[PDB]
Write a protein that binds this ligand. Sequence first.
Ligand SMILES: Nc1ncnc2c1ncn2[C@@H]1O[C@H](COP(=O)(O)O)[C@@H](O)[C@H]1O
Ligand SMILES: [Mg+2]
Length: 561
Amino acid sequence: MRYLELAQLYQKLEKTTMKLIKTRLVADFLKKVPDDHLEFIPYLILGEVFPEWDERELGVGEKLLIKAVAMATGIDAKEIEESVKDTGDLGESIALAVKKKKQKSFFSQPLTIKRVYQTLVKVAETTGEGSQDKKVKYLADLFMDAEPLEAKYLARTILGTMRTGVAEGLLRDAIAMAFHVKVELVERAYMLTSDFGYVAKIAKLEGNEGLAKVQVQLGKPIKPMLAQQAASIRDALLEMGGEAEFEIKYDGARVQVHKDGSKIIVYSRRLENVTRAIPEIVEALKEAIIPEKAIVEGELVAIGENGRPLPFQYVLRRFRRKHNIEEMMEKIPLELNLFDVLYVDGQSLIDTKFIDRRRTLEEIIKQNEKIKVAENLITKKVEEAEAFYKRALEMGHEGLMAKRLDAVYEPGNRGKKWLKIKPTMENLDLVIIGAEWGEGRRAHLFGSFILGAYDPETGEFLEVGKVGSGFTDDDLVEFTKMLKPLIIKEEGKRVWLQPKVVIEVTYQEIQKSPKYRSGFALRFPRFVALRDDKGPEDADTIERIAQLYELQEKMKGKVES
Ligand SMILES: Nc1ncnc2c1ncn2[C@@H]1O[C@H](COP(=O)(O)O)[C@@H](O)[C@H]1O
Ligand SMILES: [Mg+2]
């Protein structure tokens, strides 16, 4: 299949604002894709080369890209740069360079999707000595045969700036539509493997039966099972049927570990491969995990000099690797509190009752300085769990998790099989979808941020509030530098932003406002932290908010006596 057909799809996608039309376009295209392109085509359709959990990345910036295009077209980098000043878009200017290339090298050897994909992969894997020059050459080889339209999309694909309105929801729907399979099964398989390519392939070749048989695949992250919040230990035990597994709810960053022999991959909550950020934990895991193959997950916690937990922000700091891992391992010691096992030696435990998974976890983990098994208590006595809860809080943790003993693991689901019990309404993790410049001496900084809750089915982020409290001057400076590149529209003090930054905020109250489309509004939110271990698509949803609203109202309804 020619890359031109894919470029033509991108163009059609950009020419419609309609999700249903986009779904159709993508589905029709998926139907034409050769079977051996299915494993990667979904990502290319999203304008990405690899799944977010891959670790591989094209180490190509605007300059290197321009250099490759200049090399491929015979047009000076400066000229391409000067073109951007008139076009306002590098993609369009690259298309022009390629269009002009016709004068000196008129015939192209038509780009195939296969060649483009294989090239991008080679580029990403070229990190050796003179990786940069090699990447320029691979890309130049590609742009030499590109048609203008193709070049524009190849460029945006390389830069990660593709703007097709295709989100995971639409891609899921497109796969279901293209191969006449149940969207629920496409979703089930996606929650288990986080791999749209894998899911699409199976959908096409095996249909529903195949999708229903999909099991976790070692190395591919499983979307984490989430939890609803209960008002109290008592309420949690009641919901559980009178008995439950209780565990300390550790305040750190959730990670998922895949082990194959001595090979370890650790994924963060947003499924970023963060293995490289925590070498000491990886080493500890090779030792702590007994079975050759396993997938387990836990809460990675920063530990202070007094042995108590440090703020979870410290763990997220470790993930960003802004300082040398060497210094940070010293400055920010970590401990991983494992709380689930989803696979062991070729056997998926997703459909295994929790009690068996926990027993397996206890059996498979030889705890060490770094790797621990979450402390638990299985009880039917509210007072026992309450004592455990009190202790969890005195220990500096968040409270307790209560988990149904007979429940299977539900990838990506925020059900009631796992419940969180805390002393306060949990903070919301929302997407910054806009901001407003501050006033007076703060006019050069964003001083307020519009928060959006993610909508999976639609892919958009609906406004649920505006936070302008809790940020120190430095926070404002940092967020302004971080968000300026995301501006997509500006109007007075108001700026609209690409939905990419998730932040945690407290709120005085969740209000059910007829006002906004979301139906909700947060009363006086306050900044708590940057939650970059969560992608925009991992942010709290309207449903999550509605759930907290119900909890809030349930408690207000109980006020007095
Ligand atoms: N023992 C535990 N079991 C499960 N989740 C835990 C535990 N300790 C801390 N956590 C965190 O609590 C969260 C509960 O689900 P949610 O609040 O929906 O993210 C998980 O995502 C983890 O980050
Ligand atoms: Mg947490």
